Every structure is written in structure tokens, then in C-alpha cells.
Amino acid sequence: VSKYANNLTQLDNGVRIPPSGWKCARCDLRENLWLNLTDGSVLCGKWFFDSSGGNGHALEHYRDMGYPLAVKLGTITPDGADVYSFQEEEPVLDPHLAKHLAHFGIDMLHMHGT
Template sequence: MSLPQIDNGVVIPPSRWKCARCDKKDKLRLNLTDGMILCGQKNWDGTGGNNHAIEHYKETSYPPAVKLGTITADLEAADVFSYPEDDSVVDPLLALHLAFFGIDFSPLQKTEMTTAERELDQNTNHDWNPIQVSGQDVEPIFGPGYTGLVNLGNNCYMAAPMQVVFSTRSFNSRYYINQSSKMAFEMAPADPTADLNTQLTKLPHGMLPGKQSVPALENDDKANARTTLVARKGVGKANSAIKQILQMNTNGSLASAIFTGCP
């Protein structure tokens, strides 16, 4: 990593760090260009820092910063964050960059999680109960707009985005209200299973009317559902690059559906 560092006389103490702009003493990041110690980003729930590290980057364009609480003798495990890339990066010269500001990393102990560890912890231990009905018996709902999609084991990432996009007026108008399944098949090429327009038309005509959204028979948990299997083939056919994105990636599937099928 080619990193110009500013010789401004800054020497970082081995402990008792504090944000240069507020009273935060945890989740601090050391800017590796000028030696400024600033707090990290504020989380959606008000926890975390006060955004001073990223504000400093916007003011100076000094890109990399290392999370002080992750520095140990094992520098490969330190959390170095690149603001232009908005992601963690590897700094093979981190020892030299720390030494520039007088930091001896060998005795330092890890006190905080890295960005990757924090994301994993949130995904694993997050309490979803506030947005879910937990511990209660609920009655299934049926009718127009309430047809589910069958999870075939490899298409759950595609089902959720399809339900999202077909809840929007633009997709409903284009593929449901203003076009029938018969019309789509008549305009389709020789292989309609690989035609994006045909599949994006067929799917809402199965999902939205509610003809299949009826109380399920006993032991039949798929009576109120459609499948996205063929639609997935159509989206992938429309853009070969999307085939790789569709590998178990909900965010990629949503983006693909929007950019390839948006009216």
C-alpha cells in the first residue's frame, strides 16, 4: 500500500486514546496519513461513534484508518479501513505506518472487534423479536397479493426480491396490469423459458390475482405458493454477468431484477 504520511510531529501514546473532536474513548480509528485519532461511525440505533473519522476523511481525503482496539502483535488481524472503498483492506506495511507515529504494536492487546467480526456477530446474535411475531399463534392470510413463493432450496434469495419488486406500481403496471401472460408468450422467442419479459410477466400473474392464495390443505405447506425457478433462468439469460451474481445473493438478485426488468 503506497501511503504518503505527513510528518507533523504527532506521536501516539500506547494507551488512553480519545477522539480529537469529542469524548469518545472506544471504537477509535487512527488515520494513517496524519495521525488523527477520531471516533467511528454512528449506528442506526445511536450507538457507536459520532462519525468524526469519516468526516475527517471527507475534509482531507486521507483514506486509510486503523481501528486502534484491533492492533496486536498479529498485525494481519488489525482492522484497516479504506474510506474510498468503504471496506476493510490489507495494509502490508502497517508496521511501518504505525512506527511513523511512534506506535510499538508488539505489547498491544485486542480490545474491540474488527468490522468483519462485528458484522458476523450482529448477523448471528441480533434479536429479531422486535420485528417478528414471536411466541404467538398467527392466522395465515389469503387473497390477492398474498401468494407466496416456494423455496426450492436454491432460490430463496430470488423469491424475496421478486416479492419486493412486484409490490411496486411500476413493475405491476408493466408486467401485470398492461400485459397478459398470453400476450407475453405470443411475443416470446423460440424458448420462452429464457425470455426475461415472458417470465417477469408470468410470475405476477401467478402471484397477484390470489387464485392460488387459498387455505392450505393439511400437510400441504406449498398450496399458497408459486416458484421463481424459471424466472431465475430468464433473468440470468438476460445478462450473463448476472448468473454469477445470482449465486445465493439477495442483494444482487434485487439489483439484477431492477436493472434488467425495470420499465
């Protein structure tokens, strides 16, 4: 569980999650994405060997905003999703996933949670 999730600061500043449901800033990846919990910056992170992209936008986001938390998009299930912390450096959980995703328009139950 993320310890930063307790003190999760969200920043609605032009946050507009795309009609694609997800896709990162830098590269053109449809998967392996990291949706920032704060301002809603969607980035990604390739799984070792990838031939589509996965550049270092995460560090840039730490340079720009400094918010080291993002949801691993694509792993979103009715139960929950995977989250990565750049601050804790670990794959972390969030006891407010549903709230955060719901505030993002991300409905886990939409496909098969109802």
C-alpha cells in the same frame, strides 16, 4: 488488503499521538477509534449501538484533509490490526502495518509480541 496502502502518503504535520495511546478528535471515545495513516488524525466509529459517542468526524477529515484511511485502534494485536478505508469503503489490510504503527510509536509487541 488496501490498494491505497501501496500508495500510502503520510503527512507529519503536528502529529502527536497522545499519552492515552488513542482517543478521537470529536467525541470522547477510548475505543473503536480510527488512527489516520496520513497525518495521524485519530477518530472513531461506534459499533452500531453506543451510548458514549462516535460522531461523523471521518467525513469531516475527508473534507479537511481528504485522506480516507485509518487504523481501527483497540484491535491492535502482536500479529496486526484492523484498518478501515473510507475510499475503498471496506475494512482493509496493510502490508506495512508494523511500519506504520511503529512510525506512530504503536508497538504491537510491547504487550505480548516479544
